[PDB]
Symmetry: D2
Subunit: 56 residues, 4 copies
């Protein structure tokens, strides 16, 4: 099963303190979490895709 | 950033060990892990898509 | 290169009259258009995917 | 409905003759074909995505 998850320290006015949904956070948590079961390798970028945006 | 992760406890032939990469495991771990930062909602299925398979 | 195209002759008024961006239209035009160069096979459904929808 | 189509002028083997599955071919044919029904705009790149590649 393919799981889709958007992680991008959503910027917003406030200054906030720390983040949670960081790109590096996913790699580390996901890799560390799954490594415990025997998963390894490296994060590879997905194949480039083009999408038509309507305008008229 | 959109993150792609395949989780499917595929176990055709082998030992009677665990899997960890279970669909339910992702929802629970991902939801529980992220909830700690203020994320909620429900897992929704992605929009159906069709892909052309070559043959000839 | 992967190309993304949304084809769905949706209607939200009353006077549809006709369509163009139909699912069947894509298969036929795309298959007929590409067949001219040596492409064949059948339209296969993409692998199911799940996306987390925020709520809070 | 989202339609997935891979178009890439990668031939490698063979000699010079003709083509059909070119990136520019899709934009032109798809735009010209659909413009006839009232579709416009420009080809925009899809959102970057990362996929974990197994290794061990």
């Amino acid at each position: 099963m393919q799981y889709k998850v958007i992680l991008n320290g959503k910027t917003l006015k406030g200054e906030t303190t720390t983040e949670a949904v960081d790109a590096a956070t996913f790699e580390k948590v996901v890799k560390q979490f799954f490594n415990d079961n025997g998963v390894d390798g490296e994060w590879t970028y997905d194949d480039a895709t083009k999408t038509f945006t309507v305008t008229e």
